[PDB]
C-alpha cells in the first residue's frame, strides 16, 4: 500500500469495526466453542481486525438488522432461499397454522408431500420428486440413481461449478485435463473419491469432445446449466448439444436448479433453455425457508428409489428392482417443510409469470443503471446477471469494496452471490445504486482505483 | 401356509386395509409423482394388498391420528426424533415466538449458535461444536476431518451399525474379512467409494486386533457405541480397549450418538460409559423436531473447519490452517432449528437427571413386563433394550407381528426402531402391553406360533 492508500485503510478501519463491534465481539467470544468455517472469511493478516461475519438480529421484508442495530438493504437473501423476501405473508401464516394444528409427526408419512409433488410436476415438468435434506444431499443422491440406473460410475462435472459438499464432487481439474481423474479440492478429501469424477471445462467445444468420446462409460454430466459464479454464461447452444450426446448414449443428463429453480422462472433453467434434463435437483427457495433439497426427473432414472411403481388388485410388482439403490434419511418430507413448500408453490401458481417479469426486469434495471454509471465514470467494475441473481466484476479489491457496501448499508455475505426479492422496492434499487457509487467515489479518494 | 394359516391372513388382511384404507388410497395416488423408496417396506406378492405405509393427519403427546382417523399409541417417535412426545409445550412456544419476533434470517451468522455450542459443551464435555443439516451430513464431515487432522484416509466402521447415507459408509465386508476394502451396499454406489473403507465384525474381540495391526493407517474408527439394531449390545470393555488403542495411535475415535445422544442420558453415550471421542456426531433429538446434525469434539480435530482458533489485539492466526478442509451448508444454524436446540438444552439442563431416570425405568418396565408374559407363555420373542430404546427378536414373522401392532393402534414404522417418550402415560404403556398380548394371542389362535 501507498501511504495514502495505508492512512484510508486505516481511517476505514476503525469506523467499520465500531459500527459492527457486536459482531466482532460475538465472533472471537464464541469462535472456539462454534467451530464454523465462515469465521475465516476474506481473512488477511494486515486487516484481521475488521475480519469477521455479521452476526443478524432481525429481518424483514428486504432489510436484516444486526446485533449492532444496522439495518442493513439485504442482497444475500438467504444465499438465494428469500425470492419473496424474509417473512412474506404466507410462509408467516404456514408457520403460525403450524402451532394450532396438531401437526402431523415424523416417523409415519407426510400427508401433504404428495400435492407438493403434483405441483412441482406442474410447474416443472419433471415426472417423479423425492424429497431430501438439503442441497447437497440431493446432489449426492442425484448422482447414485444415475450411477444406479445405467449401471456405469463415471461422473463428469464442470469446472467452476458448485454442486454441495458431498464428497464425490469437491475435485479439481487434472494437471493433464482432459478425461483423467480429478484431484481432491482440500485436505480430508480421499484421492478414492476422485477416481469416478471428471472435470472439465464450461462451455469449451472440445469438453463436448470429451463427454462423446467418453460416450456409453458415462453415468452421468452434472452441469450448473447458469453457473451462480458466472451468471453471464448462459451456454444455450452448448447444453442443447449436450442433451444430445448424453441422450445418444445412455447418459444422465444431471442439471443442479438448487439455484436457478423457481428463480429465473417457474420452470427453472430447463424452461429458460427449453431443454428437459433426466434429473434435476432443487433447493433453496422451494422450502419456503425451511431446508429442504429435491432429486426429480424421469421415472427411468427415478425409479432406482422406489424399484418403480406397481398396482393394487393384479400381479404387478417394482420391475426396477434390480437397479434399486439406498436411500434414507430422518428429516425427509419434513409436517413443516412440505406446508412451507405447499404455501410457496401455491402462490407462485396463482401469481403467475408476472411475479417473474417483474421481478427479472427490477434486476434488468439496476444492472443497467450500475454497468451505465461504471462506464460513463470510467471504473473497473461490471454487472453480470441471470434473472434476479448478480455479481459484481472487477479488478479492484473486491474484499474492500464489498467492506464499503456492507459499511453503507447493502448486506453482502462473503460469496458475493446477490439477489433481489419481490420484496425490493424502487426506493431499495435507488440505495444500492447510490451505495455503490458512494464506494466507487471513496476508493477513488483514497487511491484505490 | 396351512389352511388355519391362510384363513387367518385372507380375514386379517380384509379387516386391516378397512381400518387404513386412506393410507392405502394416498400412496396408490401419489406413488408415482412422490417417490420415496418407504413405499416398498415389506412388501411380499401375496400379501401386496396390505403394503402401504400409514399416512399421519395428527399427532400430540404419545399419539398420532392417520389420515382415517384412526388413533396409535406412537412408539417410533420420529425415529428417536422426539424425545419429549410430539409438541412438547416449550418447542411449541419457541415456534410460536419465532411468528412474531421478526426472527433473522439465513445468510448472515446466528446470534444463537454460540450458546447452543456452550450448553452443548456443557452437557457433553466436548470442545468445539460445529452445525449441519443432517445426521448424515454430520458423519460425512466427521469422516473429512478425520482425514483431515490425520492426513490418512482408511476408516474403519463395525458390520450393523448405521451411519446414513453418505456413500462412503455405504458398504458390506470384503468377501474376505479382516482388513481388505469393504464392498458396496448397492447399486449406485461405485468401489471408488468403498476402497478407504473397512467393516470388521462389533464386540468380537479379534476387531480390535485387527485394528491394531492395522497401526498408524487408519484416519478414524467410527463406531455407533450402541448399535440401535442390536440395543442388548452394550459393550463397555471393547469400547474402553478401542478408545485406548486409538489414543495411542493418533487415530480418531468417532463415536456416532446420532441416536444415543441426549437420550441415554444427558451426556449420551459417552457419559454412560465414561470414554471421551475425538469427534462425535449428534443429532435427531437435539434440533427439538427440526433438521439437524451436529459434529463436535475435541479442537485437534475439529480445527479442521476453521484452521483453529485466535484472537484480536495481537498477532495470532488460524495455526492448522494447512490441514483446514472444505465445508459449507445453506441450512447451517438455521434460526429456527438453533431456537428449538437451544429450548430442548435449556429443559433438558433445567430437569435435570430424573428426566433420564424416570424414562430409562419406564422402558426397563415396559421390556421386563413383556419379556415376563413372553416367558410366561412359551412365546419365542423378546424384548432388548438401551435407554428408552427397545426393540423386538423373535422368530415368529416379524413383518406379520407389526402389522398386527399397527392394526391394534401401535405405530411402528417399518425400520423396527421403537423409543418411548417423557409423553408416554401409564395408560399408553399398559395398552402397548395389552396391543403385544393380544398380538401373540390372535397370532396363537391363527396358527403362527
Ligand atoms: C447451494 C447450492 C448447492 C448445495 O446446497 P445446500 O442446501 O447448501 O447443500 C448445490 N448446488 C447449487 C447449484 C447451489 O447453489
Ligand atoms: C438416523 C441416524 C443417522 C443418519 O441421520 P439422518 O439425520 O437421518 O441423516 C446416522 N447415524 C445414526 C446412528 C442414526 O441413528
Known amino acids: 500500500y501507498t501511504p495514502q492508500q495505508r492512512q484510508y485503510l486505516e481511517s476505514f478501519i476503525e469506523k467499520y469495526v465500531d459500527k459492527t463491534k457486536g459482531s466482532k465481539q460475538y465472533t472471537d467470544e464464541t469462535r472456539f466453542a462454534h467451530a464454523n468455517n465462515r469465521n475465516l472469511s476474506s481473512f488477511r493478516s494486515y486487516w484481521k481486525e475488521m475480519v469477521y461475519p455479521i452476526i443478524a438480529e432481525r429481518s424483514d421484508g428486504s432489510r436484516m438488522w444486526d446485533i449492532d442495530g444496522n439495518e442493513y438493504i439485504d442482497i444475500t437473501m438467504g444465499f438465494g432461499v428469500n425470492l419473496f423476501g424474509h417473512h412474506p405473508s404466507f410462509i408467516t401464516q404456514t408457520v403460525v397454522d403450524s402451532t394450532h394444528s396438531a401437526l402431523p409427526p415424523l416417523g409415519p408419512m407426510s400427508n401433504v408431500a404428495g400435492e407438493v409433488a403434483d405441483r412441482i410436476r406442474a410447474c416443472t415438468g419433471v415426472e417423479r420428486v423425492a424429497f431430501y435434506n438439503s442441497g447437497t444431499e440431493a446432489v449426492m443422491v442425484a448422482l447414485r440413481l444415475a450411477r444406479a440406473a445405467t449401471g456405469r460410475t463415471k461422473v463428469v462435472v464442470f469446472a467452476g461449478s458448485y454442486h454441495g459438499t458431498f ?3 469437491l475435485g479439481v481439474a487434472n494437471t493433464k485435463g482432459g478425461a483423467e481423474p480429478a484431484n481432491p479440492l482440500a485436505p480430508g478429501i480421499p484421492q478414492s473419491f476422485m477416481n469416478d469424477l471428471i472435470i472439465l471445462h464450461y462451455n469449451h467445444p472440445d469438453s463436448l469432445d470429451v463427454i462423446r468420446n467418453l460416450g456409453n462409460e458415462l453415468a452421468a454430466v452434472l452441469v450448473e446449466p447458469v453457473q451462480s459464479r458466472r451468471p453471464d454464461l448462459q451456454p444455450e447452444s452448448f447444453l442443447k448439444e449436450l442433451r444430445a450426446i448424453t441422450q445418444q448414449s445412455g447418459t444422465a443428463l444431471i442439471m443442479d436448479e438448487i439455484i436457478t429453480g423457481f428463480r429465473i422462472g417457474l420452470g427453472g433453467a430447463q424452461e429458460w433453455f427449453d431443454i428437459q434434463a433426466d434429473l434435476v435437483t432443487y433447493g433453496k427457495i422451494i422450502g419456503g425457508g425451511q431446508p429442504l433439497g429435491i432429486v426429480a426427473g424421469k421415472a427411468e432414472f427415478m425409479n432406482t428409489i422406489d424399484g418403480g411403481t406397481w398396482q393394487y388388485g393384479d400381479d404387478s410388482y417394482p420391475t426396477d428392482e434390480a437397479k434399486r439403490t439406498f436411500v434414507a434419511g430422518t428429516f425427509n418430507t419434513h409436517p413443516l417443510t412440505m406446508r412451507m413448500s405447499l404455501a ?15 421481478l427479472n426486469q427490477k434486476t434488468t434495471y439496476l444492472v443497467d443503471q ?48 446477490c439477489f433481489l426479492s419481490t420484496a425490493h422496492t424502487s426506493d431499495d434499487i435507488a440505495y444500492i445504486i447510490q451505495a455503490v457509487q458512494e464506494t466507487v467515489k471513496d476508493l477513488r479518494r483514497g487511491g484505490f482505483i
Open 370 to 417: 450500475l454497468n451505465s454509471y461504471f462506464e460513463q465514470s470510467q471504473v473497473p467494475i461490471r454487472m453480470v446477471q441471470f434473472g434476479s441473481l448478480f455479481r459484481f466484476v472487477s479488478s479492484v479489491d473486491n474484499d474492500l469494496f464489498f467492506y464499503h457496501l456492507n459499511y453503507k448499508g447493502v448486506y453482502v455475505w462473503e460469496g458475493r452471490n
Open 344 to 358: 410457496v408453490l401455491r402462490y407462485l401458481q396463482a401469481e403467475g409469470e408476472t411475479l417473474y417479469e417483474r
Open 167 to 169: 464428497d464425490g464432487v
